[PDB]
Structures are given as structure tokens and as C-alpha cells.
């Protein structure tokens, strides 16, 4: 909606990325966004203010400003925040938890102590929403209305891919697209190191490697063909590419990426088990 | 230019990718493009014809049609093609070799036997030009005019990144952005396998992993910050991402990507040494 | 009506003769095979089939219309010296030897008669069950009809296609050596079944049937082997867990290593032969 | 000349395995496609479209599949089996043979669910694989408490029309899952890598795929038709000092054999682990 007001409890990296994406998309004017942090001297806080976002140290003011309320504090702080603002949740509120691991059940339990039927949505997104190319999934809670999920999807589709999932997939999504950008940043640093080793200036190597990864990812998104088929399509017999693919295989490249998704997913599950405990 | 006619000797994967990119960009109408192959029954040939590209089995007709002439046959076939069409090169022609490894010197030597001052440009591009997100470098030959390089850059910038380089960087670029898409396809297959292992449907895992890589690459292209800093920015203390980055490091992930760039570059150098020999 | 000869009466002569006779393209007694050692198990098996056996390579040549060279590669030049004067204009000489070039064969035979009809092939032992994988390249003087005849004959015992000669050493590393990679894999898969509680006989049968069915699936599908693997592997399931442990050992790289090592050894041996 | 003229077959679940089995049965000529019904809550699946083109009858309602069928294949994911049994348990009649295809799921668990509605359900548990689609599957089955002797013979007749089929004790089926259930995926991985090897050494990709697949097919057929040990068949390929023995050495140096043992073990153990989780629920 044009009248919709959005708030962020937690004015850090993710609040900045989403606010920048939303305002770049034009789906929200910056003045319709309020964010709160217990430290008005942060870099993200100053960046948000320059964009035109309203800032406050008082989470209650963010709640009173907002229709859609994003929880963008660290997961261990979620229970603290819900106890602080629980009595301020109203019927109009859609509470959107961005925290890794934290279950809809745990959120609904804390909030229902103050007012029955909190409308809760859980999402897992990632930092590339800042360039409107995020990957977002969401699950709807017990009292979320049908239009609540559609509203969520409309908003988050403005900054990237967005689809509804069952909540029990979100920890695995965290391991894949939540942590995914960090795998790519690591890969791009190393690819640039390889370019530099073979004689390219570092700035050109970074640009070429990032462009290669962006273009390849877009090709796969626009293709019906299997990634293995696209692999087959880009390796000439006896050529340079198939020689490089062999050295990746000899190091177990594929297994390392499987290891990574698994380790991030398992850590996410472990953190939440400690929270519930 | 609007009057410019473009030809491809070799109507295979790369000719299709460039022709699709050029026509999607609107910089060339398909009817201004001619491509030739000794087998009019190929899949790429049929795809090119549906787009509106002119096709012929006779390389001489492609030469007579064209102002800009792309050589898109395999590197070992370049010398054969130059001997076949050498007497047909005219003053108006810009000969653009896309072949990995093949030097401007070797091309100019073959063509100068027929007519002095062939205008030659060497490029290294990649398949994502098909979605207008290629990575292209080019080097200008002895008799290339100044406007020849600018024309080249204008044309190839319509389908992705394009910059001029010294020719002695092109074999390293091949190892990085030429082979790069294949590294990404391999990585995306493995990331999807990881998503599937942790419980995601395969189609969703492929979509999320590709979107993660696309978004991360775009973030780096739009950032002044170091990829290591972006890595630092997306890993919370004690969190899922830093746990996954550790298992990548324990397998030497970075070294495998360095190995790959090196192996592709070295194979490219080795193939050309065999050609010159 | 075709008379076929094998110089060499070993494993490949036996496999091809068994395949050809099971296909009904040749009567066993229209095949003649020669070896200097008639006390071999392969010779005893050829004899039981009804194949004609002789110690004299000249007799095999004079009997034959199509002449297969089925001796070890380092024996090929000795054979060509021995019976080169006996090659007639009617002969089609089919070298099965790994690595040995058409050029090397034609150089020897052309010193006797000027236009020897030479075909080079690379096949494999599953011709014995009519599921071989065969490629061939035609020599300088081989007629178009010679290639067509070769393809009809070798298609009776499996897949067969013409290739450029410069691919044959790589084919050797893939489908020539391939059956041995498969036998090794099947032994290990059976060991895995036995470790998890299956009787050996059942584990061997199930593993071999799994491999046969999967290979036939791929041959009958237009889909990529990665997509076929996706149709097996359910999210969180048993197969994707097993695929991970294969990946962690670099399973794919070992098979690439194998094809490469077989191809390179083939090229290296021929390099030695050309030097000598 | 086999044909079950009085047999109606149903599939609960219209996914990969339902398609593969229906394609194999119809290609074998033992069943007409219109005597097969399959149900699924998602009628926009590619597998559903393929079944429709074969002539298979399709419905969203599992009760209709039950009422149509004599032999009822359960072809849903293992964690969905208990929900299915609660849904159509009251619809099971004396005539039904319930054939569970689900990995891990025990006859005991199926019989307990169905027995709450009607005593003596006839249950058979099987483990098959996708190559039934080309009639070269590998299938094992175990008969349940109330299955008649004719039930097992009938199912062996049906499943033998699409590949190898043999009766086993149920305690072997999780290990079979790790070997021939997951087996085709090991083969697809191996064939992709073998083709990568052929391409590295200069072969066109299409030829490399064809040759590698044919090599694996022929070798598997050789072993199935031979009385000799796989090591002896390997000895007939490898000449002294030759190309093959050089390649086998590099496989050995990487522990190739151990990886395939690891795979069978990992798939079997995961199958057991998943069922232990189901029993705890
Ligand atoms: N950055 C990422 O890559 C993604 C982050 N997330 C989730 O988003 C949440 C935050 O992520 P980041 O923004 O990276 O953390 P961050 O640490 O950059 O920002 C956290 C913010 O919370 C503020 N804060 C701390 N205590 C507070 C309180 N009592 N009341 C209000 N604000 C308070 C801090 O001052 C800081 O501004 C976490 O739950 C994380 O799981 C999920 C997807 C990806
Ligand atoms: N595909 C890629 O990833 C990239 C390819 N390249 C270069 O582009 C060139 C071709 O690449 P692909 O298109 O992938 O090869 P491709 O094999 O798909 O197409 C090659 C084309 O050449 C044709 N051809 C063969 N002999 C010919 C002749 N005598 N006259 C005319 N056409 C003939 C073939 O019929 C085929 O259509 C190579 O030199 C390669 O190094 C460079 C950058 C990346
Ligand atoms: N066994 C296989 O898997 C395949 C073999 N080949 C090729 O087939 C040829 C033979 O291979 P195998 O049959 O495996 O070897 P093998 O050693 O089983 O048979 C070789 C035969 O040549 C005979 N021989 C030795 N000196 C002779 C002479 N002077 N005149 C006539 N015969 C003589 C030996 O007695 C022996 O019977 C080799 O060149 C090999 O590269 C190619 C494809 C597959
Ligand atoms: N795919 C394989 O390689 C093999 C699979 N199996 C077993 O076969 C069963 C199915 O395997 P796939 O067909 O590969 O799964 P799949 O996921 O392709 O098909 C599953 C089907 O179940 C349907 N479904 C979900 N809930 C349902 C409900 N309440 N009522 C009816 N249908 C419902 C889905 O829509 C889908 O059509 C699993 O239990 C698996 O263990 C066993 C051997 C091999
Ligand atoms: O030569 C080629 O086309 C390349 C290959 O190795 O596939 C693409 C970059 C080198
Ligand atoms: O909790 C977080 O913010 C994540 C991290 O591990 O950095 C990003 C995805 C999990
Ligand atoms: O349950 C299944 O479908 C299997 C899997 O791993 O997905 C195939 C054999 C086990
Ligand atoms: O020469 C031979 O017989 C071969 C070997 O490795 O021995 C089989 C394919 C090469």
C-alpha cells in the first residue's frame, strides 16, 4: 500500500539493506520507515538517516509508527524485544521476524501473553536485497491473515526473489541463500587471487570474476537446462575449461559447498535448540 | 551503426550466444547478422534461423555480407579459415577473433599474405552474453584503426562488461572469466545438492543458490568495499555463516579456485604453443 | 558368405567371434584364428565354438576376406612384416590394436602391394554379449563400401560409429578400459552390500542390475545425467546422503583420472613404438 | 504372454516412481493404461502430465484410487505414509493388496495403522528403482503377516515384468535401498564424470556420454551373464603394462573401492535413521 508504514526493531546491517532496497524499488518512501537502536551513533544508523528514514532509540515509538514491524535484532535478543514491546502490539500489526532459527511458535508464545492472535510471519532473507537481488522465503504464523502473506510477498519481491515455504525449510534455506553470499564473496576473493597470480591487475580480476559469477547465475535462472548441462555446454573437448574443472574435482570442490550448506543449517538448528532450552 | 553488417564464421554455441545478446540488446537486427557452418542441420544453426539470422554453408558469403567478421570456430580451425577466406578480406573488414589462445600475430601473418594491413581485433568473451551479462576483453591489432576499438567496445558493451586490455593478459582472462561460468555452474549444482541434503526440494534449491550467487556478485560490483570486508559484513559472531566458512577453509576452498584459474590459463598457453609449433 | 580371420587368438578374438556367431552374422567355421601357442584357454574356447584354428598366420590371411589384427600392439609390426606379402587387393585389414596408427600400418603394407585397405577400430569385451562399444576410422585406400561393411558387422555386436582417427586413443581410455572400471565398481558395491548385511550373491546381482538399468536409462533419455540423479534423490533422503560421501572422496575426479591415465598410456606406448 | 485381465492397479502418489512403474508396466503389456489410476493433490506436476498422456486415469482423491484398485501401490514419500494410511484406512477391503514402495517404512508400522480400521490387511513391502521405466529395474519385496501365498507370487509376476525381482526377508530391505535403490544415482554420477574424462582427452561430449553409458551397460550385462568373478572379467580387459591397468592403479590410489562401500553404507544407515525417527514419532 501507499499508506503502509514500516518499522525495524534493530537498525543494523539487515535493516539498512532492506530499507535501501525498499526505497530504491520505490515501494516505500524513506519517510514511511522508522528504525530503532539503543545506540544512535552507529554507522548503519547514520546511513539510514541520510536516506531519509526516521530514527529513534525507543522501540515503543517504532511499534507505534509501524503497520509492518520487522524484527532485525540478533536471535538471542528476540525474546527480550518481545517482552519489551509485547503490550504495545495491536490488531493492525504484522510482526515479521527476520532472525535466523527463531520459531514462529516461540514468538507467538511470548506475544500471546499480552494480546491473543498476534499476526506473525517468519522470513529468511539475505544482504543482496540492498541491490534488489535478494533471496527471501517466508512462513506464515497461526493468526496471519491470507492477505498478510500476500502483502509480505509483494513487499519482499520488490527487492529480489520471494516465495512462501513451510517453516521447517527455513533453517536449510539459511544454509543455502542466507549464508550463500558469504560463500560467493570468499569465492570471488580467491578467483581474483588466481587472476592476479596469472598476471591480471587486482581491480580487473575482481571485476571479471564478479561479472563471470553474475552472468552465470543469470544464465541458470533464465534456462530450463540442468546446471550440469550448462557445464557441459561451456567446456570444449581438450580445452582450458575442462582442465580447470578437473582440478576443482580433484580437490573435492563440490563436497566443500555441500559441507558449507550443511554446517550453516546445522548451526542454525543448534542455536535454536539452545534458545528453546 | 545502424548500417553495420555482422558475420560469424562458425555457427555454434558462441555465435548463438552473441547473436542472441546483440539482438536482445537492440543494437543489431537479426537480419543484419549472417552465420556460416559446414553443417546446416545443427541445433545452434536452427536456433539462429528462428531468431531471424541469415545462414549459409559458404564462409565466402558470410565474408561478403559482413563489415564486422567474428571468427567463432575452434582455435585449431582458425588457420584453415584464414586460408579459405583470406583473398576475400577487403579494406572495410574488421576481423574479430574469438578463439582462445590464438594470437593477433598469427592471424595478421596469415591474412597479410593476401592483402596488407588486415584490421584484426582479438577478444575473449563468455557465454553469459546470451543474457547480456557477459565479460569481454579485447586487444587491437597492428592495423586496427582507433575507431575500430571504439566500435568493438560499443558493440560488446551491449551484452555485458567490456574493456580493452593488452594482448598478453587475454590467456589469464580466459582462465578467470572465460572458464568462470563453468566454475559457477559446478558450484551451483553442488550448492543445490547441499540444499537437497538438508531437506529443500531440488527446484527451490537451484533457484535460491543461483539467486544468492547473482545477488552477491551484484553487491560486489556495486560496492567499493573489499570482498573480504563484504565477507566480514555478512558473518555474525558465533553464527551459521562463520561456521560454514570454516568448513570451506578447512577444505582449501580458496586454493581450488586459484588452482582452476591457473590450470585454465596454463592450458590456454599450452594449446597456443602447440599451434605455433 | 564372408570369411573372417583373426591374427591373434586371445581375449578379443574370442569375444568378437562369440558375439558375431551369437548375432548369426557369421558361421563359426567361417572364422579362422591363428596363434603360435595352441595351449591357451582362449584357443580351447574358440575350438569348442567351431572356429578354425591354425598356428600359421599365412593360413589365416589366405582364408580371410576381413582380417582382424588382434595381437598385442607391440606385435603388430612383426605381424605386418610376416604376412604383408600375403595381403591381397580383396582384403580389408582391421586393426584392433590400441594406439597403433593407420599410418604405421599402411607404411608397412604399402611396401608389398600399393593400396592396402585398412580400418582401425577400438572395441571392448562386451561384444561377447552383443553390447560392445566400437568406433572405427577408415584408412587412405578403404572404400566407402568398406566402412559401411565394417559398421554393419560391428553394429551386430553393439554400438558402432565412425570417428576421426585422432579420437581413438581417448575412446580407448573411456570405453576400451571402461568395462574394467565397471567391474571394479561392481566388486566394491557388492562389498558395500555385504557390509550392510546382504548375501554376496544377491549383492552382486543387485549392483549389476542397478548399473545396467541406469546405463540403459541414460541411453534412452534426452536428459542430463544430473537430472536423472535428481529424480532418484529425495530431499534429506538416503541417496543424497550417499552422494555426499562420494563427493567428499573426489569420486568424480578418480574417474576423470582413470580415463586420462588410460588415454595417456595409450599415447605413450605408441610414441615408444614410433621411436623403435 | 502374461496379462492380468482382472487386475486394477492404483497409485497413491503420482510422482517419479508412480510414473516409472506405470510406464514400465504398460510398456511390458501386462497392464492397460486405463486400468491404472493415480492420485495426487498437485495435478500440475510434470509426472502427472506424463501419466495423463499414457492413458492413466487421474484423480485428486485418494479414496477414488482405493475404490478403483485391487493392487494399491503407496508411492508417496515415507513421512507421508502414516497420513495416507489414516486417510484411506477405512476404505481398505478384503480384496486389496497394499504394496508400500516407501524407503524404510516397516510392514509392522503399516499393518498397525490399517489394522485399527479392519483386521488382516494384506501388505507387501518392496524396494525398487527408477530403471523399471526401461524394464530393467531391480526389485525386492517382503510379504506381510496376512499376505496370502498367491499375493507374493502375483506381485513377483507383476514386478518381474519390469526388471529383476526376488523375495527377501524384510530385514534386508534397508541395505538393498543403499545398493540398488540409490544405485542408479551412483551410476549417473559416474557417467557424468567419465564423460568429463572423455571430454578432457578430446572427445565431443555427446560421444563421450554415449560411449561411457554403453561401456557400463555392456560390462553389467557381461557380469550378469557370466559365472566368473568381477576380478576375472577385469583381468581379461587388462593386458600387462597396458592402458587399463594404468587406469586401475589411479582408481586404487584414490580409494575408489572404499568410496562405493561408503556410499552403500551411508544410504543404508540414513534409511535406518529416518525410520527410527518415524517410529519415535
Ligand atoms: N545480515 C545478514 O546477513 C542477515 C541477517 N539476518 C538476521 O537479522 C538480524 C540482524 O542481523 P544484522 O542486522 O546483521 O545484525 P546487526 O548486529 O548488524 O544489527 C543488529 C542491531 O540490533 C541493535 N540492537 C541490539 N539490542 C537492541 C535492542 N534491545 N533494541 C533494539 N535494537 C537493538 C544493534 O544496535 C544493531 O543495530 C539477526 O537476527 C540475523 O539473524 C537474517 C538474514 C541475513
Ligand atoms: N563457448 C565458450 O564458452 C566460448 C567460446 N570461445 C571460442 O569460440 C570459438 C567457438 O566456441 P563454440 O562456439 O563453443 O564452438 P562450437 O563447436 O559450439 O561451434 C563451432 C562451430 O564451428 C563450425 N565449424 C567447424 N569447421 C568450420 C569451418 N571450416 N567453417 C565454418 N564453420 C566451421 C562448427 O560446425 C560449429 O558450428 C572457439 O574458438 C572458442 O575458443 C571463446 C570464449 C568462450
Ligand atoms: N582385451 C580387450 O579388452 C581389448 C583388446 N584390444 C586390443 O586387442 C588386441 C589383443 O588384445 P587381447 O585379445 O586382449 O590380448 P591377448 O594377449 O588375450 O591375445 C593376444 C594373442 O596374440 C597371440 N600372439 C602372440 N604372438 C603372435 C603372433 N606372432 N602371431 C599371431 N598371434 C600371436 C597370443 O598367443 C595371444 O593369444 C590388442 O592389440 C589390444 O590393444 C582392444 C580393445 C579391447
Ligand atoms: N524415486 C526413486 O528413486 C525411488 C523411490 N522410492 C519410494 O517411492 C516413494 C515416492 O518416491 P518419488 O515418487 O521419487 O517421490 P516424488 O516426490 O516424485 O512423488 C511424490 C508424490 O506424492 C504426492 N503426494 C504428497 N502428498 C500426497 C497425499 N497426501 N496423497 C497423495 N499423493 C501425495 C506428491 O504430490 C508427488 O506426486 C517414496 O516413498 C520413495 O522412498 C523407492 C525406490 C526408488
Ligand atoms: O576454448 C573455449 O571455448 C573455452 C573452453 O575451454 O571451453 C571457453 C574458454 C576456453
Ligand atoms: O544470523 C545471521 O545473521 C546469519 C549469519 O550467520 O551471519 C546470516 C544468515 C545467518
Ligand atoms: O526415498 C527415496 O526415494 C530414495 C531417496 O534417497 O530419495 C531413493 C531410494 C531412497
Ligand atoms: O591393449 C589392450 O588390450 C587394453 C589394455 O589395457 O590392455 C584394453 C584397452 C587397452
Amino acid at each position: 500500500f501507499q499508506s503502509m508504514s514500516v518499522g525495524f526493531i534493530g537498525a543494523g546491517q539487515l535493516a539498512f539493506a532492506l530499507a535501501k532496497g525498499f526505497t530504491a524499488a520505490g515501494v516505500l518512501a524513506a519517510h514511511k520507515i522508522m528504525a530503532s537502536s539503543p545506540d544512535m551513533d552507529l554507522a548503519t544508523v547514520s546511513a539510514l538517516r541520510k536516506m531519509g528514514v526516521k530514527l529513534t532509540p525507543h522501540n515503543k515509538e517504532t511499534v507505534q509508527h509501524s503497520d509492518v514491524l520487522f524484527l532485525a535484532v540478533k536471535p538471542h535478543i528476540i525474546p527480550f524485544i518481545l517482552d519489551e514491546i509485547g503490550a504495545d502490539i495491536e490488531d493492525r500489526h504484522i510482526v515479521v521476524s527476520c532472525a535466523a532459527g527463531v520459531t514462529i511458535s516461540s514468538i507467538e508464545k511470548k506475544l500471546s501473553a499480552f494480546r491473543p492472535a498476534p499476526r506473525v510471519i517468519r522470513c529468511m532473507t539475505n544482504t543482496p536485497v540492498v541491490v534488489r537481488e535478494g533471496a527471501t522465503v517466508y512462513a506464515t504464523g497461526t493468526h496471519a491473515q491470507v492477505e498478510d502473506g500476500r502483502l509480505m510477498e509483494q513487499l519482499l519481491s520488490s527487492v529480489g526473489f520471494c516465495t512462501e515455504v513451510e517453516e521447517d525449510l527455513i533453517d536449510a534455506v539459511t544454509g543455502l541463500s542466507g549464508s550463500g553470499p558469504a560463500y560467493a564473496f570468499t569465492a570471488l576473493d580467491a578467483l581474483a587471487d588466481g587472476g592476479v597470480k596469472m598476471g591480471l591487475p587486482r581491480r580487473l580480476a575482481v571485476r571479471l570474476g564478479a561479472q563471470a559469477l553474475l552472468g552465470a547465475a543469470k544464465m541458470l535462472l533464465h534456462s530450463e537446462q540442468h546446471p550440469g548441462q550448462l557445464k557441459d555446454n561451456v567446456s570444449s573437448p581438450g580445452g582450458a575449461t575442462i582442465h580447470a574443472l578437473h582440478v576443482l574435482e580433484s580437490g573435492g570442490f563440490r563436497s566443500l559447498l555441500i559441507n558449507a550448506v550443511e554446517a550453516s543449517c546445522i548451526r542454525t538448528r543448534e542455536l535454536q535448540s539452545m534458545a528453546d532450552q
Side-chain angles (χ1 to χ4, degrees), chain A residues 75 98-100 124-125 174-175 177-179 264 268 271:
Chain A
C98 295
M124 173 51 56
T125 188
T174 306
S177 49
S179 297
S264 173
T268 297
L271 291 163

